[PDB]
Ligand binder design. Structure first.
Ligand SMILES: CCCCCCCCCCCCCCCCCC(=O)OC[C@H](COP(=O)([O-])OCC(O)COP(=O)([O-])OC[C@@H](COC(=O)CCCCCCCCCCCCCCCCC)OC(=O)CCCCCCCCCCCCCCCCC)OC(=O)CCCCCCCCCCCCCCCCC
Ligand SMILES: CCCCCCCCCCCCCCCCCC(=O)OC[C@H](COP(=O)([O-])OCC(O)COP(=O)([O-])OC[C@@H](COC(=O)CCCCCCCCCCCCCCCCC)OC(=O)CCCCCCCCCCCCCCCCC)OC(=O)CCCCCCCCCCCCCCCCC
Ligand SMILES: CCCCCCCCCCCCCCCCCC(=O)OC[C@H](COP(=O)([O-])OCC(O)COP(=O)([O-])OC[C@@H](COC(=O)CCCCCCCCCCCCCCCCC)OC(=O)CCCCCCCCCCCCCCCCC)OC(=O)CCCCCCCCCCCCCCCCC
Ligand SMILES: CCCCCCCCCCCCCCCCCC(=O)OC[C@H](COP(=O)([O-])OCC[N+](C)(C)C)OC(=O)CCCCCCCCCCCCCCCCC
Lengths: 50, 122, 50, 187, 329, 58, 290
């Protein structure tokens, strides 16, 4: 009864992309924008900001 | 935590509803007071329908009572339905009285717990 | 009328005599359960005398 | 184990029949063990209700033609003769009720069922007994057992009457909550 | 305990079930927890206080988004069919009273006279409840089948389906009217009345006033939809059905004519005093307004929105009136 | 006193009203159901027997 | 009584004909719906219920059980020990459908972690583990291994409590209270049944006899918090055809071609229509002869 038309947004990622003050993340430039000397990455690694 | 005296205004229905809702769903009230209010509600809900059902049965009998049956419909219906009205009002009154008395006891307990009475202290 | 007054007196007398039995629900959080507890009553002696 | 006192050595016929019925309704005892007991009970009822009918002609042919019977018939009023006949017939019927071979067979079958229950549920068979209501007799309990058997084996075993098979949830008693507390009263 | 309590326990249990919340009692019956918080008594009462309205909403949704159920429809219309089933007979008698013989049998030509005529036979099969089974069957039939075959449909489609089903089941309505207006007990039952009608007059005798019945049914369906929607034009629709009421009274007169129960025949029914063409209008309107048909299946979008909004407004009372506005949630 | 004790059979009270799990309860292990056991009131050293009876003579 | 007999026979024939027409239309509609459902299942396009959906299932959220019924759903979580048995026949063999709670989400609402180990709030849904014969019901083990736990995720950043579900997929969580094992299941969401005396579906709660699934009663007895979601609908686990006897594993999980069928079936409706048509034809023939 209380759930009637209460959650009209489900994909939080879409809203974050559309409203956050950041450059578009769909640009293909980031694939080879810079060059780095890294290797031996046998497992997925994530970058933490700051 | 409210005016006292003959000249003061008795509790209104809206005030009672607000106070009972506050006692039920407020965070400053204690678990014992909340349980008292809940027990009041659950144990008082019965009379409201018990009185109505008893009144319905009694009115059904009175409609066929020896004189009511032979009386004309104009007054027969009223005479037969009067017991239903009496029982319904009795049930509603007793339900409200029990619920409000226990809610007022809970309110007193809350007032003593939070020291909001000008002449109550340990 | 005598029957009515008798019922009223009996109801008040029953309330007064039931006062001394202090029954209260206690909620134990470890089991999350309400249990009845019986205890004595402490009150001003004037109330007991009346 | 002749010298061993069984848990139900003191139980009466009513208590034994009530225990059998309670076990069957609680499904401790399956429907496959009833038919012999039911047949024995029906035979016992038939014999009990038919004994006087067969006995009275025999008494007329042999006992009532004896010397003392003829003396009573001839030298005393017809009322007293009828009273004597009724009294002797009643005494014979009571003796039959006490020492009927069919009654003994029914008791033996009940004993077999009680032994099966004891083997199945250990000493807890005593827990199947309760304060039986007064005036409810062993015949009544046997009738109730037969009625439950017929209801469970009839066409309405799942439409109008509960099914014999048990669908109780599978839980652990050592951890599942209980409806009653040992000393206090729960809400 | 062995001869009274076993027979008295069911009555007390039924009384308690009627006078107590079954869902709340069931929730409180199960005590303890299996490993999840919120199974305590305090939470269950809090949950049930909202589950009342939640169950109301769920039942309404089921009556709308699921196939209609005869038990649900009867529960919705219990008052109109269970306790006040003699008002239908009294209204029919009042409508047909112009061409009946009751005015010569200690009854006036008014609603009070119709009530007295109905009650002179008592409360049972020959009195107040006469024809109650026929009315219940007709309701469990034509309206129920119409709901089944026109669930969630527009006004036009609903009217068409209801008209078709009323035409199909019309003879039952005629037999019910004859049983209602049989004051001297000429007919022993519905089958006997139908057999007598067929034997005396042709099968067409059972289809008298079908067109006016269908027109009045269409008007009543329109009024029901308007009142369910709640628009202010519900009063205009009430006036329209009041104006169409003479169609209903003519239908009843035609059904009750051409028989020993009436003083007039089919030809004479048309040429009856026009001053009695609104016999029972106010009683009929009052009865229908107080005990209207609660056909949730035919409720339109506006009615569903109204019901949901009312339920939400009722649900909005479960917050603390003195809740403090906190900077941090 | 042990005969007067009623908490021994308290476990059966729940199932006397709730039959749903009565079969599961009966499927438990029998330790002291409808039985009395008196602990050794005298010191006894007899390797032949692993348990001794101390039930009242009467 | 010739007229009375004729009238009664005509009424019976008319009612029977209307019933036959209604049953025929219902049979056609049900056959079309069943064919569409079979095609949808064969398409093999399941929906993964994870994230916020795991805590608030979409069908419960939008009250769209009608639209979501007969849809393949992939869920993740841990089962509860308790099991529920409902009498039912599969392939003409007597047996019991087995239902188990499946905790799809967990919420922790205790801030005094170091003082009290408050129990969490578990949001769960009933899932049908399969069907077992009556004689083999005792073979079902409490808290049995339904499906092997899903392999731990390769990503290291996923070893945290999910913002929505709250689960931690770490095989060996450093916090004992946070430890939990997750398993993946695939099933079909099914609508809860209802009492039906005519269909021989009667439940005796006190005697522990169940013939129709009562989600509300099951949730109440198992003491589950997510009672409304449980009552909304339940899932029927579906596994690819194993094509083996699997001795010992008596509870047979449902398959796309052998999942439990609804009470209302095209075969039943066709049988009812045939009976009504035969009765109406007999009545009409009798009327014509008379
Ligand atoms: C938990 C449940 C507990 C239930 C408890 C039941 C206890 C029963 C006790 C019976 C024994 C004592 C009866 C004493 C009666 C009064 C004696 C007296 O002085 O009167 C003299 C009086 C004559 O007076 P008079 O001055 O010499 O002359 C007056 C003139 O004759 C001119 O006449 P008059 O105009 O003056 O008429 C006077 C009349 C006028 O007053 C009334 O009209 C009475 C109105 C109140 C009726 C109350 C009924 C009982 C209470 C309710 C029962 C449960 C209902 C549940 C419904 C559930 C629905 C879902 O008042 C009476 O006399 C009172 C009784 C009249 C009865 C009339 C017929 C009733 C029919 C309906 C009930 C039976 C249906 C059976 C159907 C077939 C079988 C299934 O004669 C009588 O009328 C006596 C009748 C005695 C026999 C009554 C038998 C009743 C049986 C009821 C069984 C239980 C219900 C079963 C229901 C089953 C279906 C659901
Ligand atoms: C708590 C109060 C309410 C209690 C209600 C009762 C509850 C009882 C318990 C429940 C169960 C039982 C159910 C009821 C059983 C029967 C009760 C009974 O005896 O009552 C009948 C009883 C009459 O029985 P009777 O003794 O047989 O009548 C004497 C004659 O036999 C009459 O013979 P007749 O039938 O042949 O009459 C001929 C006909 C004459 O034929 C006509 O109709 C004449 C037509 C002339 C032509 C007009 C059209 C012209 C052309 C069209 C022009 C415009 C359109 C142009 C279009 C152009 C394009 C095409 O007469 C009339 O139409 C007028 C009759 C009197 C009307 C009285 C209205 C009272 C209003 C009350 C105040 C206002 C409403 C307040 C509501 C709220 C209260 C809180 O009624 C009363 O006397 C008053 C009853 C209480 C009135 C309640 C008001 C109605 C409430 C419900 C409806 C909603 C409101 C409607 C008005 C407002 C709309 C905005
Ligand atoms: C509750 C748990 C269960 C709930 C289940 C669900 C409820 C709904 C179920 C509905 C369906 C049930 C199943 C079907 C049953 C069918 C029975 C049957 O055969 O009846 C038929 C019916 C039987 O006729 P009959 O028996 O000779 O006479 C009827 C009597 O007059 C009788 O009518 P009456 O109005 O004069 O009755 C007066 C009324 C006076 O009493 C009352 O009104 C008291 C009750 C008032 C309302 C409730 C108050 C609160 C509860 C009180 C409970 C008290 C105890 C009740 C005990 C009842 C019996 C167990 O009751 C009585 O005194 C009855 C008299 C006893 C003999 C007849 C009835 C047998 C028992 C049936 C019981 C059914 C009850 C169902 C509902 C139960 C609700 C609780 O015949 C017709 O309707 C014939 C119609 C012919 C029309 C013309 C056809 C011409 C040809 C045209 C063909 C079509 C067109 C062709 C094509 C053309 C080209 C397109
Ligand atoms: C239905 C319509 C038909 C007519 C009905 C007329 C009334 C019929 C009354 C029958 C006799 C009742 C005697 C009850 C005695 C026991 C009362 C008791 O113990 O109280 C319990 C219950 C009360 O229980 P309680 O504990 O809730 O009491 C509440 C107490 N107060 C009000 C202070 C809050 O009694 C009642 O409900 C009311 C009893 C009123 C008794 C009045 C007696 C003096 C007046 C006599 C009037 C005579 C009228 C004559 C006829 C006139 C007709 C027009």
């Amino acid at each position: 009864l209380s759930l009637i038309n209460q959650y009209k947004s489900l994909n939080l990622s879409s809203s974050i992309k559309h409203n956050a003050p950041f450059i578009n993340r769909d640009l293909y430039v980031f694939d080879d924008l810079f060059s780095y000397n890294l290797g031996d990455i046998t497992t997925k690694k994530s970058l933490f900001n700051d | 935590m409210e005016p006292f005296g003959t000249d003061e205004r008795n509790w209104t229905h809206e005030e009672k509803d607000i106070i009972t809702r506050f006692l039920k769903y407020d965070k400053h009230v204690n678990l014992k007071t909340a349980e008292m209010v809940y027990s009041a509600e659950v144990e008082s809900a019965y009379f409201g329908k018990a009185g109505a059902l008893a009144g319905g049965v009694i009115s059904a009998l009175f409609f066929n009572f020896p004189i009511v049956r032979n009386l004309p419909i104009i007054r027969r219906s009223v005479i037969g339905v009067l017991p239903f009205l009496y029982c319904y009002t009795w049930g509603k009154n007793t339900q409200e009285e029990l619920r409000w008395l226990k809610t007022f006891a809970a309110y007193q307990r809350f007032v003593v717990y939070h020291g909001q009475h000008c002449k109550l202290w340990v | 009328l005598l029957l009515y007054i008798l019922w009223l007196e009996f109801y008040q007398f029953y309330h007064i005599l039931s006062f001394y039995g202090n029954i209260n629900w206690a909620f134990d959080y470890d089991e999350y359960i309400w249990t009845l507890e019986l205890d004595t009553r402490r009150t001003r002696l004037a109330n007991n005398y009346i | 184990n002749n010298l061993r006192l069984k848990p139900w050595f003191h139980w009466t016929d009513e208590e034994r029949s009530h225990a059998i019925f309670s076990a069957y309704e609680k499904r401790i005892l399956k429907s496959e063990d009833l038919p012999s007991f039911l047949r024995a009970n029906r035979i016992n009822n038939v014999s009990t209700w038919v004994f006087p009918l067969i006995a009275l002609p025999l008494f007329n042919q042999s006992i009532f033609k004896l010397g003392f019977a003829q003396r009573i018939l001839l030298t005393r009023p017809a009322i007293e003769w009828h009273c004597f006949k009724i009294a002797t017939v009643a005494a014979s019927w009571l003796a039959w009720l006490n020492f009927s071979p069919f009654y003994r067979k029914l008791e033996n079958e009940k004993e077999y069922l009680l032994d099966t229950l004891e083997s199945r549920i250990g000493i807890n068979v005593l827990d199947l007994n309760d304060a039986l209501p007064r005036w409810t007799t062993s015949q009544e309990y046997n009738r109730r057992t037969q009625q439950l058997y017929n209801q469970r084996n009839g066409f309405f075993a799942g439409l109008l009457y509960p099914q014999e098979e048990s669908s109780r949830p599978l839980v652990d008693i050592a951890s599942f909550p209980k409806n009653l507390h040992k000393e206090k009263l729960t809400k | 305990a062995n001869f009274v309590i076993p027979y008295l326990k069911p009555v007390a249990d039924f009384w308690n079930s009627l006078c107590i919340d079954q869902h709340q009692d069931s929730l409180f019956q199960f005590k303890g927890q299996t490993g999840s918080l919120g199974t305590d008594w305090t939470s269950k009462y809090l949950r049930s206080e909202q589950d009342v309205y939640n169950h109301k909403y769920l039942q309404y949704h089921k009556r709308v988004h699921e196939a209609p159920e005869l038990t649900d429809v009867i529960s919705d219309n219990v008052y109109r069919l269970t306790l006040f089933a003699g008002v239908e007979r009294v209204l029919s008698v009042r409508q047909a009273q112009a061409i009946l013989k009751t005015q010569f049998a200690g009854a006036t030509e008014n609603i009070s006279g119709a009530f007295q005529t109905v009650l002179n036979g008592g409360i049972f099969r020959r009195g107040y409840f006469r024809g109650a089974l026929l009315n219940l069957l007709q309701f469990c039939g034509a309206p129920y089948q119409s709901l089944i075959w026109s669930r969630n449909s527009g006004i036009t489609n609903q009217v068409i389906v209801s008209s078709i089903f009323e035409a199909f089941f019309y003879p039952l309505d005629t037999v019910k009217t004859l049983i209602y207006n049989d004051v001297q007990g000429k007919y022993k039952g519905a089958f006997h009345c139908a057999s007598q009608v067929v034997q005396n007059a042709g099968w067409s005798r059972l289809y008298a006033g079908i067109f006016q019945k269908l027109i009045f049914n269409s008007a009543l369906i329109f009024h029901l939809n308007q009142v369910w929607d709640g628009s202010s034009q519900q009063w205009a629709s009430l006036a329209l059905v009041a104006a169409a009421y003479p169609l209903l009274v003519l239908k009843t007169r035609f059904q009750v004519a051409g028989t020993p129960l009436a003083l007039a025949t089919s030809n004479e029914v048309l040429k009856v005093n026009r001053k009695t063409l609104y016999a029972g209008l106010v009683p009929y309107l009052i009865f229908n307004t107080l005990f209207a048909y609660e056909f949730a299946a035919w409720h339109s979008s506006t009615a569903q929105e109204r019901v949901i909004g009312g339920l939400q407004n009722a649900m909005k009372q479960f917050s603390s009136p003195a809740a403090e506005q906190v900077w941090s949630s | 006193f042990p005969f007067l004790e009623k908490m021994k059979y308290n476990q059966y009270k729940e199932y006397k009203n709730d039959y749903l799990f009565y079969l599961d309860f009966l499927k438990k292990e029998i330790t002291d159901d409808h039985s009395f056991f008196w602990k050794a009131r005298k010191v006894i050293k007899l390797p032949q027997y692993s348990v001794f009876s101390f039930v009242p003579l009467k | 009584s010739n007229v009375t007999g004729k009238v009664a026979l005509a009424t019976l024939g008319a009612l029977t004909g209307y019933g036959a027409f209604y049953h025929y239309n219902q049979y056609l509609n049900l056959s079309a719906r069943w064919q569409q459902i079979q095609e949808n299942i064969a398409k093999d396009q399941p929906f993964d219920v994870d994230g916020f959906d795991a805590k608030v299932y979409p069908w419960v959220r939008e009250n769209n059980v009608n639209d979501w019924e007969y849809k393949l759903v992939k869920m993740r979580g841990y089962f509860k020990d308790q099991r529920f048995f409902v009498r039912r026949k599969r392939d003409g063999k007597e047996g019991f459908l087995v239902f188990a709670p499946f905790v799809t989400a967990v919420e922790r609402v205790n801030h005094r972690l170091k003082q009290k180990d408050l129990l969490p709030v578990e949001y769960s849904v009933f899932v049908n583990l399969g069907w077992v014969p009556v004689e083999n019901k005792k073979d079902v083990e409490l808290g049995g291994e339904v499906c092997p736990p899903m392999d731990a995720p390769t990503d290291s950043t996923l070893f945290v409590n999910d913002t929505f579900t709250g689960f931690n997929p770490d095989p060996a969580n450093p916090e004992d209270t946070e430890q939990v094992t997750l398993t993946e299941i695939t099933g079909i969401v099914r609508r809860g049944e209802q009492q039906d005396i005519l269909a021989r579906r009667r439940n005796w709660n006190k005697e522990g006899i169940y013939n129709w699934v009562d989600l509300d009663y099951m949730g109440k007895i198992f003491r589950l918090f997510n009672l409304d979601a449980i009552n909304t609908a339940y899932i029927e686990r579906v596994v690819p055809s194993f094509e083996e006897g699997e001795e010992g594993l008596y509870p047979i999980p449902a398959t796309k071609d052998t999942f439990e069928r609804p009470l209302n079936t095209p075969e039943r409706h066709s049988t009812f229509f045939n009976f009504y048509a035969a009765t109406s034809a007999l009545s009409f023939i009798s009327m014509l002869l008379l």
